[PDB]
Ligand binder design. Structure first.
Ligand code: HEM
Ligand SMILES: CC1(C)O[C@]2(C)CC[C@H]1CC2
Length: 397
């Protein structure tokens, strides 16, 4: 009996705790014998579970193309994801356009506004003594951050979330395409507006940019817009929700982060290893052998990062969250040329999220009368995290 045969990142068996982690652990155990397995899901594809096997695939850009980065493909109409859905040299040229504003020295400029924002969000419910940490904080912190990066109105998080849902989760493909078409319409307007009155934001920047003497097509710009929006409203929101969930019941982890704030960055790294929501696909472009398996052009490999992150040959006590873990060479933010662009910014954002929350609400728990909900997908993490806590006081009247 092989767990690879019906492995499906959108349909992962959930254990009693609410998460797919029992299943991830079982699959990790099997992968010690079989690091790469065939799944009959999505018409048939390779599932890459072993840590060193994922490293081998991800370093091989000659045989594995990022044209298959989403599998099954995200609903983005005729548009593609900039950087993430491209290979070199096209890929490298586009990333260079936004390398500078995503560098650590540039993104640190947001840190104090991130603290203020997180605190203002906490204000909204602290007097109430209950709330969904996902909808209330985990979703909102990166949505607002993302809106600032894209030069969008920060109060329209619900609109941006509807678009993201269409791209990633809506099942009816007519609706999904229709709703992605709305994004495109809003994106065209914004681009036209930044064209005449540019600002400091990333969109303004890329609109004013030039590759090989030529300005980018509108479709390219829409691609930039789309992936950046995804990085925030999907990936970060789900990661932060899972973290809030863990802190809600794991009183031992919680008291330590409060007692050792100097440990928070390292714990964020460990949390990324443990609750890293993402998996990515690769399109096989030439015959290639990895370990025991020979893959063929046209086939797709899903890189199951969460399983690699629990590989006993790469991490000691992989099933434990050890906040002092170092080094921690997890794959939650990718590796190689497609390594997460947000990287340092997401670390700072997670650090601030956690620090201010524990500072304001050091005691809380899961709501016994409302259900948690895990969202399965290529990006997987908690969607609803209802909590209760002793009523507090706002900082800002
Ligand atoms: C917890 C939050 C996040 C996680 C877990 C995550 C995960 C990842 C992973 C695993 C990759 C590798 C893709 C591959 O190998 O094909 C990647 C790439 C990428 N990420 Fe994210 N991400 C997060 C947040 C963000 C944010 C906030 C942004 C931007 C605002 C962003 C922008 C990008 C871009 C542009 C790429 C492609 C870079 C390239 O192709 O060179 N991400 N991400
Ligand atoms: C899952 C992940 C990491 O996020 C996006 C936005 C970028 C790369 C892939 C696919 C889509």
């Amino acid at each position: 009996t092989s767990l690879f045969t019906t492995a499906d990142h959108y349909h992962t068996p959930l254990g009693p705790d609410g998460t797919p982690h029992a299943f991830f652990e079982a699959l990790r155990d099997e992968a010690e014998t079989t690091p790469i397995g065939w799944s009959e899901a999505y018409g048939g594809h390779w599932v890459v579970a072993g840590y060193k096997e994922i490293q081998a695939v991800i370093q091989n850009t000659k045989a594995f193309s990022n044209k298959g980065v989403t599998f099954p493909r995200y609903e983005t109409g005729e548009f593609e994801l900039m950087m993430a859905g491209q290979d070199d040299p096209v890929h490298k040229k586009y990333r260079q356009l936004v390398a500078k504003p995503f560098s650590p020295e540039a993104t640190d400029l947001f840190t104090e506004q991130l603290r203020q924002s997180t605190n203002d969000l906490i204000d909204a419910r602290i007097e109430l003594g209950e709330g969904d940490a996902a909808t209330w904080l985990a979703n909102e912190i990166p949505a607002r951050l993302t809106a600032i990066l894209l030069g969008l109105p920060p109060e329209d998080g619900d609109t941006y979330r509807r678009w993201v849902w269409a791209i990633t989760h809506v099942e009816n493909p007519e609706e999904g395409a229709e709703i992605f078409a709305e994004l495109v319409a809003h994106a065209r307007t914004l681009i036209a507006e930044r064209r005449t009155n540019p600002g400091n934001d990333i969109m303004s920047r890329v609109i004013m940019s030039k590759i090989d003497g030529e300005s980018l097509s509108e479709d390219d710009l829409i691609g930039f817009f789309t992936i950046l929006l995804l990085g925030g409203i999907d990936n970060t929101a789900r990661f932060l929700s899972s973290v809030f969930w863990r802190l809600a019941w794991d009183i031992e982890l919680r008291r330590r982060l409060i007692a050792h704030p100097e440990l928070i960055p390292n714990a964020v790294d460990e949390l990324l290893r443990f609750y890293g929501p993402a998996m990515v696909g690769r399109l096989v472009t030439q015959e290639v052998t990895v370990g025991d398996i020979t893959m063929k052009p046209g086939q797709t490999a899903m890189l199951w990062f969460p399983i690699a992150s629990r590989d006993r040959s790469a991490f000691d006590s992989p099933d434990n969250i050890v906040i002092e873990r170092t080094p921690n060479r997890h794959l939650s933010l990718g590796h190689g040329i497609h390594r997460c662009l947000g990287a340092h910014l997401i670390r700072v954002e997670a650090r601030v999220a956690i620090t201010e929350f524990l500072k304001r609400i050091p005691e809380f728990s899961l709501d016994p009368n409302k259900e948690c909900e895990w969202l399965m997908g290529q990006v997987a993490g908690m969607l609803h995290v209802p909590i209760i806590f002793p009523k507090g006081k706002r900082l800002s009247e």
